[PDB]
Design a protein around this ligand. Structure first.
Ligand SMILES: Nc1ncnc2c1ncn2[C@@H]1O[C@H](COP(=O)(O)OP(=O)(O)O)[C@@H](O)[C@H]1O
Ligand SMILES: Nc1ncnc2c1ncn2[C@@H]1O[C@H](COP(=O)(O)OP(=O)(O)O)[C@@H](O)[C@H]1O
Ligand SMILES: Nc1ncnc2c1ncn2[C@@H]1O[C@H](COP(=O)(O)OP(=O)(O)O)[C@@H](O)[C@H]1O
Ligand code: BEF
Ligand code: BEF
Ligand code: BEF
Ligand SMILES: [Mg+2]
Ligand SMILES: [Mg+2]
Ligand SMILES: [Mg+2]
Ligand SMILES: [Zn+2]
Lengths: 683, 635, 633
């Protein structure tokens, strides 16, 4: 024992194992014990994931401590050596696994039937050996240990289907609770359970990762399983089972993919946020190995607090730079919490139902939501309504023939410098769950190219998406629209209309799918608007591009002794107290905003005959009026078939805001009012 | 096996430590701070100490020379002595390590002069960091658990770069199984991992031989010294110049050489990312507090910015307010309100605009100097480098000038495309990449000052200012103060200028002779006698020394966080409304940015007066500055 | 590399030592004795302590079984704990080593039964020492000196034997040069050397099977254990049964197996070289003195020797005096005077001459039994091996300060008695043979038995024809007794009842018909005063181990001196013995005067008197008169 000394460590693992078993058996304060019920669910093949909440463990410890029984800080020990406790917990699950209440049908998946076969074979082996030893004629209490020693069966790891994950202790309980930036993940935290907060940039495709590879040796009829615990491994040549290694028979062994064990694997990559980066540095990234059923829970551009185990890996760089046992580090994901919930993930659960109806009962949800976005901005309310309509979005129509209507709004915010267009765009970026704040020129040139590159993890030549693809089903928030290269405007044409990007350059011959709603802020030609020039000559947008904008605000700056002092008082209040001036007003919290908007999105209102008759009359009068003064100094181009379609989209989204599931005349009247007042600031 | 000479050196160093009680006091401070932070939670400050090599040379020439020229044999005894002193001192229930500062004599080198005849010696190399390997932890001790026996086993690990002495090379294999043969499971979180970072120091371009390829040396930083600096900094890395490897002598061209890091000193140089902090003694803070009481404090400070330059007092006041800056405001919804003020100078040639820019570069804590087109739009902001080792991000000028100043010169010569990319940095104080699959928002909270001659060479009174400036209206809006200066031929003013210039040129530095040429000083300040200056080119105010002004700015920026008051708010609102609704052909367009800059200038003046609140006088002074900038009114 | 198991064993043994304070007190006594010895100079007890394994078994069964089964992992922790205890106690500004006594269960073996299954286990072997290597020093640390620098360098050596656990093999290279190439001058007198001796233990002849080759084991002794035994001793060596070397497993028939020595015990046995020392408690000393205050103490002790032997009271008194012995005089110039009493018993068959000799053999502190023709003059004195030419100590040399019991003295060859002359008188053995000129020292007292020449002592002929021995040899013997088996009805009867009473003797706990089992009685060399059963049935009879204690105490403590009243009595008795003719059984020489003085001194010893009085001289004269004249008062 000279080579390997020993240490007196405060932790004990058998007592902790017994505590773990007790907690699993007898935790029910959250129809019987919660985790026993979950295990029963898993036995019936209904569930393939087991989430052990550390909050439950803390509550169990605390309740056992009040009654008098001393309980070791199992939660602290998990927070210190989480990797070993995963094995402890899976062994405990195997020791308490309930019997299935429904047997194996033909609808069940292959892994379940293979595991059932393995369990039946293990039981048959054990019973056969027990029968043989009983017939040898030498009580089952003694016989069971002997049979277990003399038997060769399927190990528990290869007979379990559930995946096991932890959940960090919540911050409201008062180290896993505190979210840490990537820079603060030093070498001290290795092996613990930590929560890293940051943006997700790159997510690989789901590929099968080998846990244990199964070989078949038909000469001796044995299945041999080689565990794999690295990026690479080596196959076998001689059957290492007892007979082929012992007898003169040398059995050839072959791999079996179906019999082997795999796991869904994804090498994500989280990145530091702008708030966490210190002064003068640039964000750095940390690799995440998402494994098991947790795959596809992370997408690029997400802002998440991934909780996982900070495990080391052997050094993978150049050998010359190596000086000692250098270790590369990663984070094995356990639990993922999204800062901004996705719109496509909305379920009207009773609690979401109550927060939502409380918003409904507030009355005037449309105006309250409109004034809610960016409260620090004063007096720009029609633009806020338009942006809310942009967030809600119309209804996509795909007729049986194949025609597809956009169903999304494309808003522009042309106006003078210093009217808080960029701050409106940044606010919308805050409320919106997905959206890129693309701005300026040059940077956009490669942010829409979407070219092809090889992924390091799988060696796949995955295409890289630009800003617009990353903003799929989001808001593109393009800033400084007028100062941006014409080459990208050519792509913006097709993105706005067809919702897809067609690329036919060298190496790429595909058509990207980019369903996006574009918000554009820009200055007119010659900077400040000149009233002497016609609006079309001063907006500078070509008639094709301008047609795609459902609403094009003017936001002209016209000084006045009253509005100027109103704005000045508002801004000075915002500076002197970090809050909107309005005492009686209640700015809705952004989470409630997102929730209501998400509920609204599910509704898909349709049209009524009176509504479409009114819309047709409006379109006729708009077309004739546009034709009349198309050559005047107050012209706004010529109305196009899209202009009605925009009216349709705004009316449908307004109906979605009332959740009316059917459009009324008032919605159309408000939509026409918005479209008309979008141009009334130039008088 | 114990060694007698080792113990003798240990005793000598303990005697040295007892002689200079400053180090003992510093160790006590470290330990009490760590204990207090432990008690507060029922930043741990690292186990390190700084040794003044001058003090050691005074105490014992033999020991000082031994550390300097034979560090592998002298440093470990001193470290053990320090560890024993810490253990004895720590009456309250990981060895300590040394760090060295002082004059290294002939061993103060640069990566060009680092020849083999300095090997195995303590050296102090200075240069610019160019590469920083990402911090990869190193495994020094691995704890394993044996399931069968239920006991924990450990093994210690080491390599050549860990130990200054050459410990006997023993292979370090990982304990897969126990002595009895039982399976062993690794116990992370109980194993001890230590950080490790390789940084490369290149000779500074300020003193590199022009036109020749550079020379680089690798530095291995471990533990507390990791992540101490970033690429593009200036460092003074003192450490043992170790030589490693077999040198190819073993049957497989030279020996691999590197510097084991003992101390890293980020060095402040003009137009570099390293900020220039200064030590504030209680005497200095007392002087600052006393001087802040005067009513003419703003004038006194403003006069001291550019004593050489005659006049331009309003410009100097604006520059001082820029150096103080405003308070940036962050709200719950996520909106960020600019708290930095930008100044643009437009005027005739030889109006001392470039001189003011150079002084701002020379006096701010963190300033970056750029020219018109030498720093392109890629040079400013930031852009992806597409490095093959992949798609790294390189911070341009403005990102490196976070919480600092950017001194752009010849703003008019800038490309239109270059000035397109500057809008977001000016207003939103962020740089968005959104390029090549990289979506990032770097933080660039920089204050921009620019000088640019009018398009017609000399400002044209006959033409309107819109024709002369030729800058986009948005860019002019983003600039808080747009000063339009001129070279006007006036007898009295010009003869006063001549008097001042001839007075300035007739200056003899105190430690100099008449015909003695002035020797250039690099002045690489390290990021860590009276207040008033007797010499004055302009005569009778009291002018403060530039280092004292730097101390004043450093104190005011950190200590004071002013807040607005209703009294100041009324004045600001009245001034804003009067400016917006009165037409007097102002030089700049008047928008809500004018209100914002009124607020920020009032806040800056409040910071100058060291006031916790913004008062009426600050609002009046800010309005006066703005009116001087636009109308030209001066009272 | 600190270890948790090692530290826990260390603290467990420290708790054990704290529990049984006797070991702590012994360590304190050793320390204070060494300090006092250093104090007198402005012997050194070794840093060793004896542990009773029984107390360890009682205190901690697990640790006890660990020591016995796997001593490699248990003895070093115990030694470290003991060293820590000694350092802590030694507050006044070389590790301690550990030794064991007690029962070893199934590990108490002989060299025949040391099968390989006992390897790496603390064994207690018993046997006879055949070969002892020379006590050689072993280099463990070598202090060198660099002439140029002036700094002393040192290195520490080790080998598999000196440590129980296998250490990583570091070749022993003697430092000839400094690290910088400077020449080094070895500093003897500063480097440390440890005595090393190997002894071979062979199966004990008493317990060995007869007619089969013996089996032997090798014992490695170290430091204070060296030279604690003499070849031919019976020892109980306890230590680890370690196996050393690759044992041919590494390419060049078993493994080198030896017993590393932890403790060696010279085992006293019948007719061996080792003496038997009895511990004298203060209770024993008080009883001894109190019994010495008795009047007929000489009679009480003499009657206590052979109660099962009727009569021969004067022979018993002579044997008691011989066991006590007289004082030895070494004059300043160099001359030597014999201080031992020799006894010769010549008598008819079945007069108990041999049984008395066997009693003396079993009860003397150091006795060796020989027969006449079987043991030659080579067996007595000493012999040269010729193997180079080493001396083999014979019977008389081994019995120095002891007793030699020769049987069948009449049968022994004339050459043998020629050899025995000088040993009996001058108490030296001179070799001066084959180029080996040494004078071995053999100061022993001889008791012998011989039949009369005509088979029975026929009183019709003169004593000379019956004795049939040279006159000089009879002069050597201090007391010559002639015992005749004469028919007398009263005496025959009394003898009959005495012998019958002896035969119907029951052990304390044996059945009436149970067979009595013999025991070897291997006493370890370092209940009442009287005996319950007296076969002669009031004069008290002392218990025979108490008699051994009394003899030891008298021999050690008391050295009598002659006084004028005695001188006169002895002078007159010698004169009237010499000048009067009564047909004595022996002629009278100055040796008779020496015998009178020696018997007087022995009697004074018996009374524990620092001086010899008139009564002792009277007793000596009367005993000698009974010896020679055959008559008393
Ligand atoms: N209506 C307004 N409400 C609040 N702040 C405003 C308003 N108009 C302008 N501002 C302020 O003026 C500045 C202009 O912000 P920004 O969004 O960059 O303007 P733009 O993009 O329109 O040029 C900001 O400091 C903003 O807070
Ligand atoms: N008002 C002034 N006071 C002192 N020196 C001045 C003044 N105006 C110009 N100079 C001097 O004239 C030179 C030109 O100044 P510079 O800053 O290079 O001019 P420009 O405005 O063309 O950049 C410098 O040497 C400067 O010291
Ligand atoms: N006086 C006696 N008292 C007791 N037993 C005696 C006596 N004389 C002889 N015996 C017994 O007779 C036997 C012969 O004694 P032993 O010493 O062998 O005689 P020997 O003088 O021929 O050597 C022994 O068993 C001894 O006990
Ligand atoms: F001057 Be703003 F960014 F339109
Ligand atoms: F002639 Be200057 F540098 F504007
Ligand atoms: F017959 Be006996 F042994 F003198
Ligand atoms: Mg903008
Ligand atoms: Mg210039
Ligand atoms: Mg006989
Ligand atoms: Zn096989």
């Amino acid at each position: 024992s000279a080579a390997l000394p020993s240490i007196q460590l405060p932790v004990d693992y058998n007592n902790l194992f017994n505590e773990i078993t007790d907690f699993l058996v007898t935790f029910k304060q959250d129809k019987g014990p919660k985790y026993m019920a979950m295990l029963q669910k898993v036995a019936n093949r209904e569930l393939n994931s087991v989430i052990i909440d550390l909050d439950d463990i803390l509550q169990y410890q605390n309740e056992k401590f009040l009654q008098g029984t001393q309980a070791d800080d199992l939660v602290s020990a998990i927070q210190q050596n989480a990797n070993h406790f995963t094995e402890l917990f899976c062994r405990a699950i195997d020791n308490n696994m309930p019997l299935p209440t429904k047997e194996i049908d033909y609808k069940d998946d292959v892994l379940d039937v293979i595991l059932n076969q393995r369990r039946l074979r293990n039981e048959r082996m054990l019973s056969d050996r027990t029968n043989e030893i009983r017939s040898e004629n030498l009580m089952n209490d003694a016989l069971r240990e002997v049979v277990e020693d003399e038997t060769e069966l399927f190990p528990p790891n290869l007979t379990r289907r559930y995946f096991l994950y932890f959940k960090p202790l919540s911050q409201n309980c008062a180290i896993s609770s505190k979210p840490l930036s990537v820079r603060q993940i030093k070498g001290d935290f290795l092996g613990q359970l930590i929560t890293v907060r940051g943006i997700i940039t790159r997510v690989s495709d789901v590929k099968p990762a080998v846990e244990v590879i199964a070989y078949t040796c038909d000469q001796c009829g044995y299945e041999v399983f080689q565990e794999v615990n690295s990026r690479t491994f080596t196959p076998l040549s001689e059957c290492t089972s007892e007979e082929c290694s012992q007898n003169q028979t040398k059995g050839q062994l072959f791999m079996s993919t179906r019999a082997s064990k795999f796991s869904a694997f994804q090498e994500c990559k989280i990145q530091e946020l702008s708030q966490q980066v210190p002064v003068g540095h640039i964000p750095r990234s940390l690799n995440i190995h998402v494994n098991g059923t947790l795959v596809r829970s992370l997408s690029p551009g997400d802002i998440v607090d991934v909780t996982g185990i900070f495990l080391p890996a052997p050094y993978t760089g150049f050998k010359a730079l190596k000086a000692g046992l250098l270790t590369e580090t990663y984070l094995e994901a356990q639990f993922v919490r999204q800062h901004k919930k996705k719109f496509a993930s909305f379920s009207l659960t009773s609690d979401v139902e109550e927060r939502v109806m409380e918003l409904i009962t507030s009355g005037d949800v449309y105006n309250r939501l409109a004034k809610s976005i960016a409260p620090e901005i004063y007096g720009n309310l029609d633009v806020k309504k338009a942006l809310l309509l942009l967030l809600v979005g119309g209804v996509d129509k795909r007729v049986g023939d194949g025609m597809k209507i956009r169903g999304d709004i494309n808003v522009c915010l042309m106006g003078d410098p210093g009217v808080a267009k960029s701050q409106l765009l940044k606010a919308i970026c805050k409320i919106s769950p997905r959206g890129v704040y693309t701005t300026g020129k040059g940077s956009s040139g490669v942010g829409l190219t979407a070219a092809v590159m090889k992924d390091p993890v799988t060696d796949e030549m995955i295409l890289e998406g630009g800003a617009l693809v990353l903003a799929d089903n989001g808001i593109c928030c393009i800033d400084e629209f007028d100062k941006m290269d014409e080459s990208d405007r050519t792509a913006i044409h097709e993105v706005m209309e067809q919702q897809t990007i067609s690329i036919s350059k060298a190496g790429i011959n595909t058509t990207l799918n980019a369903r996006t709603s574009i918000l554009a802020a820009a200055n007119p030609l010659y900077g400040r608007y000149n009233p002497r020039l016609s609006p079309l000559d001063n907006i500078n947008l070509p008639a094709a591009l301008l047609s795609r904008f459902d609403i094009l605000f003017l936001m002209l700056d016209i000084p006045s002794r009253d509005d100027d002092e109103k704005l000045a008082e508002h801004v000075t209040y915002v500076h002197m107290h970090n809050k909107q001036p309005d005492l009686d007003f209640t700015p809705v919290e952004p989470s409630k905003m997102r929730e209501y908007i998400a509920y609204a999105k599910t509704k898909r209102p349709v049209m009524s005959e009176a509504v479409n008759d009114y819309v047709v009359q409006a379109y006729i009068r708009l077309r004739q009026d546009s034709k009349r003064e198309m050559d005047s100094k107050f012209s706004f181009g010529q109305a196009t078939p899209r202009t009605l379609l925009g009216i349709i989209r705004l009316s449908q989204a307004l109906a979605k805001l009332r959740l009316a599931d059917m459009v009324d005349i008032d919605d159309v009247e408000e939509a026409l009012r918005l479209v008309r007042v979008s141009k009334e600031s130039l008088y | 096996a114990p060694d007698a000479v080792f113990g003798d050196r240990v005793r000598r160093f303990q005697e040295f430590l007892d002689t200079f009680t400053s180090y003992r006091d510093s160790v006590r401070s470290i330990q009490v701070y760590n204990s207090n932070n432990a008690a507060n939670y029922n930043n741990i400050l690292p186990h390190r100490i700084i040794i003044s090599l001058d003090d050691l040379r005074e105490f014992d020439r033999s020991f000082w020379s031994g550390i300097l020229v034979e560090p592998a044999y002298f440093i470990p005894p001193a470290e053990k002595a320090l560890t024993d002193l810490a253990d004895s001192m720590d009456d309250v229930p990981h060895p300590w390590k040394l760090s060295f500062k002082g004059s290294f004599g002939a061993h103060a080198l640069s990566p060009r002069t680092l020849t083999a005849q300095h090997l195995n010696k303590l050296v102090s190399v200075e240069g610019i960091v160019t590469k920083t390997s990402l911090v990869r932890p190193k495994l020094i001790r691995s704890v394993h658990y044996a399931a069968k026996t239920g006991r924990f086993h450990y093994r210690d690990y080491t390599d050549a770069t860990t130990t200054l002495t050459t410990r006997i090379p023993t292979p370090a294999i990982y304990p897969t199984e126990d002595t009895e043969g039982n399976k062993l499971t690794t116990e992370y979180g109980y194993s001890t991992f230590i950080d490790h970072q390789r940084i490369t120091v290149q000779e500074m371009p300020e003193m590199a031989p022009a036109g020749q390829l550079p020379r680089s040396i690798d530095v291995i930083l471990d533990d507390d010294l990791v992540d101490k600096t970033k690429p593009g900094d200036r460092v003074n890395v003192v450490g043992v110049f170790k030589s490693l490897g077999a040198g190819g002598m073993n049957q497989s061209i030279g020996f691999k050489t590197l510097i084991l890091g003992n101390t890293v000193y980020p060095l402040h140089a003009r137009s570099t990312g390293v900020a220039a902090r200064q030590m504030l003694t209680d005497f200095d803070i007392r002087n600052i507090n006393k001087l802040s009481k005067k009513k003419d404090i703003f004038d006194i400070l403003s006069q001291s910015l550019a004593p050489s330059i005659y006049g331009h007092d309003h410009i100097k006041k604006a520059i001082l307010l820029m150096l103080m800056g405003g308070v940036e405001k962050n709200l719950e919804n996520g909106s960020h309100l600019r708290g930095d003020i930008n100044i643009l100078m437009v005027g005739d040639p030889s109006t001392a605009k470039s001189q003011l820019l150079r002084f701002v570069l020379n006096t701010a804590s963190l300033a970056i100097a750029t020219t018109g087109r030498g720093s392109s739009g890629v040079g400013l902001t930031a852009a992806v480098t597409t490095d093959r080792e992949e798609r790294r991000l390189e911070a341009g000028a403005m990102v490196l000038a976070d919480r600092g100043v950017v001194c752009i010169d010849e703003f008019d010569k800038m490309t239109d495309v270059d000035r397109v990319a500057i809008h977001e940095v000016m207003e939103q104080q962020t740089v968005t990449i959104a390029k090549a699959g990289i979506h990032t928002t770097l933080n660039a909270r920089c204050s921009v000052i620019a000088a640019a001659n009018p398009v017609f060479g000399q400002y044209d009174v006959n033409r309107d200012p819109h024709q002369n400036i030729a800058l986009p209206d948005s860019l002019l809006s983003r600039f808080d103060l747009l000063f339009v200066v001129t070279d006007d031929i006036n007898e009295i003013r010009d003869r006063s200028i001549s008097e001042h210039v001839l007075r300035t040129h007739r200056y003899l530095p105190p430690g100099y002779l008449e015909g003695e040429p002035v020797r250039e000083r690099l002045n690489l300040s390290l990021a860590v006698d009276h207040v008033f200056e007797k010499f004055n080119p302009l005569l009778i105010p009291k002018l403060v020394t530039i280092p004292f002004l730097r101390k004043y700015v450093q104190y005011a920026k950190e200590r004071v966080i002013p807040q607005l008051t209703q009294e100041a708010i009324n004045v600001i609102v009245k001034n804003y409304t009067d400016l917006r609704n009165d037409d007097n052909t102002k030089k700049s367009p008047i928008t809500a940015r004018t209100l914002e800059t009124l607020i920020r200038l009032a806040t800056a003046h409040a910071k100058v007066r060291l006031s916790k609140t913004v008062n009426k006088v600050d609002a009046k002074v800010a309005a006066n500055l703005l009116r001087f900038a636009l109308l030209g009114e001066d009272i």
